[PDB]
Amino acid sequence: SMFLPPPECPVFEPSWEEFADPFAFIHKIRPIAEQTGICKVRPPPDWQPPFACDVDKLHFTPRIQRLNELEAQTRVKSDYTLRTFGEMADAFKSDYFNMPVHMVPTELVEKEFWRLVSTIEEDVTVEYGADIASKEFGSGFPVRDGIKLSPEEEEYLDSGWNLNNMPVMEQSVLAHITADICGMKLPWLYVGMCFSSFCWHIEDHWSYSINYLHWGEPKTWYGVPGYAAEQLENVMKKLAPELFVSQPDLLHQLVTIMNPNTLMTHEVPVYRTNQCAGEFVITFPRAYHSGFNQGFNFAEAVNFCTVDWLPLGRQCVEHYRLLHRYCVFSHDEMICKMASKADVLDVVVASTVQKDMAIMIEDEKALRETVRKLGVIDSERMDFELLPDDERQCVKCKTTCFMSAISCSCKPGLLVCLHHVKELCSCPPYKYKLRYRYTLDDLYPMMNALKLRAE
Template sequence: MVIEEKNPWPKGRNRSNGRIAKEKEKAYNFCLDHVKWTNEIAYCPEYRPTKEELMDPLIYLQKIAPDASKYGICKIISPWEVSVPAAHVLTKEIKDFKFEALVQNLQVDTKGAVYKEDRKYTYGTFEHKANEEFLRRFPRAGGRPLSYTEKRFWLQMAHDTETVEYAVNVEGSAFSSNPNDELATSNCNLKNLKKLPESVFRHLNRTVPGITDPMLYIGMIYSIFAWHVEDQYLYSINYLHSGEPKTWYGVPSHEALQFEKVAMYHVFASENFSPTWEDGVFRRIAEKTTMFPPNILQQHSVPVYKALQMPGEFVVTFPRAYHGGFNNGFNCSEAVNFALKDWFPFGKDAGNRYARLRKQLFVPYEELLVKEAMLLTEYTRESASTITAFIQYMESLNRNLMSLRNPNVPFVYAPKSETLICSLCHRDCYLASVQCVCRIRCLFHEAAKLHCSKGCNITVYLDHEILSVETKAYDLQREEIMSKHTGVCSCIEDGLHLGRELNTKLGESGASSSTKPAK
């Protein structure tokens, strides 16, 4: 660790729940010079939109994203006054609201030290416990400046073995159902984001808690949200309903690989990673148990920015932007993921990494990409990233279909069903899959892996809309596509023709036995 001063209190110190000893308070004050680096972290951008600008918050985010994304995170101050507080919603509007909390050790790496207690809290009982914990750590009346609280946090991370509790991923929402609450009835109610016209998630016909639908986070002093990127490199937005502030640190997405490199060499130095170290470090950080001081990143030329989120403020994190932080006392926040059109290149990179790790996606990337592309009518600056990702996807699909053109490999239309999952890499197979009686494979593997190792006959199953999807790809950027590869449509049509010929030769019974899909 960068903080190398000796522990100012003995290892066998008292860990009772009584008031903090004056000697310990003095020792912290004496050590504050060791964390002066907290003063050197620049703040992320802060925006103050009007109610009119937030009529559609996703359009507003598209407007500020070119600048705000350079910092990894940004803060948006809500123009609305909340008329129904979160405490009322969670104690009066929602009946029998109870939740569990994680117990966190205050240390850099909490792997194996985060667990749940067998206890259910109400909003009031957790608030009472959180306030007691705050007074135990800060017994003096009048409070301290937040800069002091931040410095104390990092000193305690270096020296403490005490625990705090944090209720994370709690199902529910603290936005009121009262029709007179302006914020709750606006599109900035996080429950409404997925339905907006600019939301990629509007194509989904199912919910994914915490991804498409918001969840609650109820914290106490120094409870931690460890360094991480969002699932599938998605956007996230967090609204602080009430309580004490949250301190955030963010790293721009273009520094994500450098962030992982610093973590490997300077945080996980004792661990052995494979030659594909990036994926190993990513898997390790994805456990959300690591919170190291951001000055380690700064010392290795990785920019870090911070935000101090107050009640009534939103914090947005951008695709593949590492972020983490802590709570400055009892508070209640709510967060959800979302995706805009410019997310698709990040979604592609995340999908490739998840495939290497055999980690299943939370939302079906291929389905979302195709459905979004099918609605585009022209090539514009706003749609450019979607179109590029779509064309690259279709080109790759076509190359692999071409490799399977064989009189003994029929192409047939698949029956309508839910999205299939590749048994090799856990990608979703939206437009095409290779199947035998043993398993399902996506089209993004070398030819040898697409054939069955047991010698079973394989069949290429195609979605009924695949030809119209290919036609759409030509329409969106005909000249570029035609200059780069041969016609996808002809490949698919030839494959389907071969499938029909093969079925005719084998007869109905033979065809059904050889092309039976995996279950």
């Protein structure tokens, strides 16, 4: 009636030993959590990272948000201090409910949220902070500067669960990517207020994400396991087709608020949780999620990729191609970068990269055979990684080229991937040129380095 809360997602309480390695722990819980899409992780009770900040010197620019179900919103991509915002946010919640803020039950805020977003009459708008860390506003976790740290801050400086360290460990595949893809591998900071929400979405390249609520009122999450992603997309194509009209930017993707009950009605499994201060939420690959904040709070989140993810990362790029969606980075460029550093790679990493590289190479062999039989004869090596990413997207499917592309003197600067050789210009095939990063004879040694390192 009105709102039936979805079943709770899994909640984990690792001992200090399990909690020690984040990647090991995630791999342990994965068979459970990937069935629900999201899961919650409660750190051991003494794991208590110091949060220190002055609420008066931290400034940020607020984003405005209208709260209407099925209305398109743009993915984030007139100035508050943390104190002035906190004052605005607490006054808002307190006035909305005529209650002291920490007396409004979470049950009620959830019910109320889904009421006001569905009611066309209500014109409720809220504000929020979302930005990567910077000089005006930095990580809520300890980092390193020319200012001195307390002995407890240094304890957490190198933690696995310090989300600054998360991308750059020897088990996050996104680590030794050197490309300038800052939105991806850097932590985002989120200042919430009551009802401020994050629309349904999956992470770029179907990465994991991990979210830490530093302090404040809870955050409410809904999640859908990765296997139900296309079920959910179908439900949303049916009820809100405007979100699916083609967009020209990776910054122009459209997303929306939608009642979990609507999804559950249409046989999509949804799970929920309330994330409280000091808890982590983890989202698995291609797991849809959305939610809202219960009140004033502060969260930090980062994307990451384990070896488990590599095959999905390839399937994701295939899927982007079939959608003509822009990529953040070249998956193949990443694989080859790792292969070229095979001597210093973690050995399970090296084993998994090798399996992905073997698929890459077989697929590339076939594609080159196909363009040869189409009459493309001339060819030259080309260092794709030197090109700005906007200078090496397939003109048809927008995939970021790295292994190979077709060019034509006829249309200077334009490229197509090998799936879209027909789509470049009208010249006969002999005017085309296969531009390639590597010959097959370069590639098999790179793969053998990986096999040696894995043994």
